[PDB]
Scaffold this active site. Sequence first.
Site, PDB file in Angstrom:
ATOM      1  N   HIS B  46       0.811  -1.228   0.000  1.00 40.79           N
ATOM      2  CA  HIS B  46       0.000   0.000   0.000  1.00 40.79           C
ATOM      3  C   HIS B  46       0.834   1.263   0.000  1.00 40.79           C
ATOM      4  O   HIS B  46       1.938   1.257   0.516  1.00 40.79           O
ATOM      5  CB  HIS B  46      -0.832   0.075   1.315  1.00 40.79           C
ATOM      6  CG  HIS B  46      -1.550  -1.191   1.644  1.00 40.79           C
ATOM      7  ND1 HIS B  46      -1.322  -1.904   2.793  1.00 40.79           N
ATOM      8  CD2 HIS B  46      -2.442  -1.913   0.928  1.00 40.79           C
ATOM      9  CE1 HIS B  46      -2.085  -2.974   2.812  1.00 40.79           C
ATOM     10  NE2 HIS B  46      -2.749  -3.025   1.672  1.00 40.79           N
ATOM     11  N   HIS B  48       1.000   4.611   1.858  1.00 42.89           N
ATOM     12  CA  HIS B  48       0.502   5.238   3.084  1.00 42.89           C
ATOM     13  C   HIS B  48       0.680   6.751   2.944  1.00 42.89           C
ATOM     14  O   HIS B  48       1.445   7.198   2.113  1.00 42.89           O
ATOM     15  CB  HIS B  48       1.224   4.660   4.306  1.00 42.89           C
ATOM     16  CG  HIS B  48       0.732   3.288   4.690  1.00 42.89           C
ATOM     17  ND1 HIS B  48       0.217   3.005   5.933  1.00 42.89           N
ATOM     18  CD2 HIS B  48       0.661   2.131   3.981  1.00 42.89           C
ATOM     19  CE1 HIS B  48      -0.153   1.726   5.976  1.00 42.89           C
ATOM     20  NE2 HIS B  48       0.125   1.178   4.814  1.00 42.89           N
ATOM     21  N   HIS B  63      -3.507   4.423   5.218  1.00 46.25           N
ATOM     22  CA  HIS B  63      -3.450   4.349   3.748  1.00 46.25           C
ATOM     23  C   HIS B  63      -3.785   5.682   3.114  1.00 46.25           C
ATOM     24  O   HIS B  63      -4.652   6.393   3.622  1.00 46.25           O
ATOM     25  CB  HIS B  63      -4.456   3.322   3.260  1.00 46.25           C
ATOM     26  CG  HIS B  63      -4.079   1.934   3.628  1.00 46.25           C
ATOM     27  ND1 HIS B  63      -4.880   0.839   3.363  1.00 46.25           N
ATOM     28  CD2 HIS B  63      -2.964   1.464   4.241  1.00 46.25           C
ATOM     29  CE1 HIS B  63      -4.269  -0.246   3.818  1.00 46.25           C
ATOM     30  NE2 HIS B  63      -3.095   0.102   4.330  1.00 46.25           N
ATOM     31  N   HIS B  71     -11.381   0.724   2.683  1.00 52.61           N
ATOM     32  CA  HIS B  71     -10.343  -0.094   2.097  1.00 52.61           C
ATOM     33  C   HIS B  71     -10.890  -1.137   1.152  1.00 52.61           C
ATOM     34  O   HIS B  71     -11.892  -1.793   1.436  1.00 52.61           O
ATOM     35  CB  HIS B  71      -9.564  -0.792   3.194  1.00 52.61           C
ATOM     36  CG  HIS B  71      -8.471  -1.657   2.681  1.00 52.61           C
ATOM     37  ND1 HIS B  71      -7.231  -1.158   2.354  1.00 52.61           N
ATOM     38  CD2 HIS B  71      -8.429  -2.981   2.418  1.00 52.61           C
ATOM     39  CE1 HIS B  71      -6.460  -2.141   1.929  1.00 52.61           C
ATOM     40  NE2 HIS B  71      -7.172  -3.255   1.926  1.00 52.61           N
ATOM     41  N   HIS B  80      -9.147   2.785  -1.142  1.00 55.28           N
ATOM     42  CA  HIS B  80      -8.286   3.921  -0.879  1.00 55.28           C
ATOM     43  C   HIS B  80      -7.419   4.138  -2.109  1.00 55.28           C
ATOM     44  O   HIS B  80      -7.051   3.184  -2.784  1.00 55.28           O
ATOM     45  CB  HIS B  80      -7.339   3.560   0.252  1.00 55.28           C
ATOM     46  CG  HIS B  80      -8.021   3.254   1.550  1.00 55.28           C
ATOM     47  ND1 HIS B  80      -7.569   2.274   2.408  1.00 55.28           N
ATOM     48  CD2 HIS B  80      -9.071   3.847   2.169  1.00 55.28           C
ATOM     49  CE1 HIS B  80      -8.309   2.286   3.502  1.00 55.28           C
ATOM     50  NE2 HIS B  80      -9.230   3.227   3.383  1.00 55.28           N
ATOM     51  N   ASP B  83      -4.506   1.757  -2.195  1.00 54.54           N
ATOM     52  CA  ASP B  83      -4.739   0.311  -2.163  1.00 54.54           C
ATOM     53  C   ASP B  83      -4.250  -0.442  -3.392  1.00 54.54           C
ATOM     54  O   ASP B  83      -5.002  -0.582  -4.387  1.00 54.54           O
ATOM     55  CB  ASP B  83      -6.234   0.021  -1.986  1.00 54.54           C
ATOM     56  CG  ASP B  83      -6.722   0.380  -0.591  1.00 54.54           C
ATOM     57  OD1 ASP B  83      -5.859   0.585   0.304  1.00 54.54           O
ATOM     58  OD2 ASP B  83      -7.937   0.477  -0.300  1.00 54.54           O
ATOM     59  N   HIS B 120       3.605  -5.417   3.852  1.00 57.63           N
ATOM     60  CA  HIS B 120       3.082  -5.912   5.133  1.00 57.63           C
ATOM     61  C   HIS B 120       3.376  -7.377   5.472  1.00 57.63           C
ATOM     62  O   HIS B 120       3.778  -8.186   4.627  1.00 57.63           O
ATOM     63  CB  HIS B 120       1.566  -5.737   5.163  1.00 57.63           C
ATOM     64  CG  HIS B 120       1.117  -4.337   5.405  1.00 57.63           C
ATOM     65  ND1 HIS B 120       0.905  -3.836   6.671  1.00 57.63           N
ATOM     66  CD2 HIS B 120       0.811  -3.333   4.549  1.00 57.63           C
ATOM     67  CE1 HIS B 120       0.535  -2.571   6.589  1.00 57.63           C
ATOM     68  NE2 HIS B 120       0.469  -2.241   5.315  1.00 57.63           N
ATOM     69  N   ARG B 143       3.981  -3.694   9.575  1.00 56.37           N
ATOM     70  CA  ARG B 143       4.689  -3.086   8.445  1.00 56.37           C
ATOM     71  C   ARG B 143       6.097  -3.642   8.459  1.00 56.37           C
ATOM     72  O   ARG B 143       6.865  -3.385   9.404  1.00 56.37           O
ATOM     73  CB  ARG B 143       4.701  -1.581   8.625  1.00 56.37           C
ATOM     74  CG  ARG B 143       3.301  -1.034   8.683  1.00 56.37           C
ATOM     75  CD  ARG B 143       3.186   0.453   9.062  1.00 56.37           C
ATOM     76  NE  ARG B 143       1.773   0.784   9.256  1.00 56.37           N
ATOM     77  CZ  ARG B 143       1.258   2.001   9.217  1.00 56.37           C
ATOM     78  NH1 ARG B 143       2.038   3.047   8.977  1.00 56.37           N
ATOM     79  NH2 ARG B 143      -0.056   2.160   9.410  1.00 56.37           N
TER      80      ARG B 143
END
Lengths: 153, 153
Positions: B46, B48, B63, B71, B80, B83, B120, B143
């Site tokens: 993602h 962020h 995000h 999401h 998002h 995403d 992630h 993360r």
Amino acid sequence: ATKAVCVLKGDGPVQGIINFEQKESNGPVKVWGSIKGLTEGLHGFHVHEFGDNTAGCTSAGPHFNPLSRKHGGPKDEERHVGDLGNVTADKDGVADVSIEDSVISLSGDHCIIGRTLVVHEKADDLGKGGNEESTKTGNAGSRLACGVIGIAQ
Amino acid sequence: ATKAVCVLKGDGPVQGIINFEQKESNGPVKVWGSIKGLTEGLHGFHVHEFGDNTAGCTSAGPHFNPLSRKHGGPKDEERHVGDLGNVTADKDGVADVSIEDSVISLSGDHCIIGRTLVVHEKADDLGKGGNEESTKTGNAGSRLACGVIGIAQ
Ligand SMILES: [Cu+2]
Ligand SMILES: [Cu+2]
Ligand SMILES: [Zn+2]
Ligand SMILES: [Zn+2]
């Protein structure tokens, strides 16, 4: 207002955090923070063109220079956009940075978001060194630490 | 074409380089590169909000979500901007990433330069997990590595 931040890191002991704040479009940008692990004295401090750290500080390229000018000090008309001069490290190797510059920007043509801030081995000679290198990098020498300038909350 | 690059690092062994390229204004952005040190299988991927690494990947915030939506997966209408779904690491822990997306951009309202790319711990459930957490992060967990997205040559 727009805010940015940069975490500086390198292959040695130099590390720091630098903040950027701009209240208005085309307004001054305050650059402030702290860098530790430096030798006592002046150290060149510049925004380099690319936010590319794939090969460490070397891939950030040269000084940010959208106007294709020669290197100078922050107060010179003839300077690169990224020429912020020198910062000063004290006897303990800590540089408390506090600068205001209106040539860099956090939005628009002279935007530095996504580019790289670098702190150097030696002092920037502000273009007064009498060699070819002086009008390119100020003879500031190696890149001790760098980071990509990012959007801050 | 506008180009960007991100070097991903974290507290563990996850490391990578991800390239971005947008050939046309507001057009598709190609995202590709390689990430290593990952456990085999799916990992959330993602953009962020903040390009702030002062407290590690934690300070990157949530995000990137300029449209205030929930999401989802990259192919969902409801997602998002940040995403990008999942990447897949092979038995050797290597994810060879290649994604094309037209919601992110390297310019304009959905610009991601100066923001943070994150990979992630777990699979992103793409909003289909049946709880609140799924509608925020896809339950992708910790993360593992991140970097600020910067302008590339
Ligand atoms: Cu420099
Ligand atoms: Cu995420
Ligand atoms: Zn310069
Ligand atoms: Zn999301």
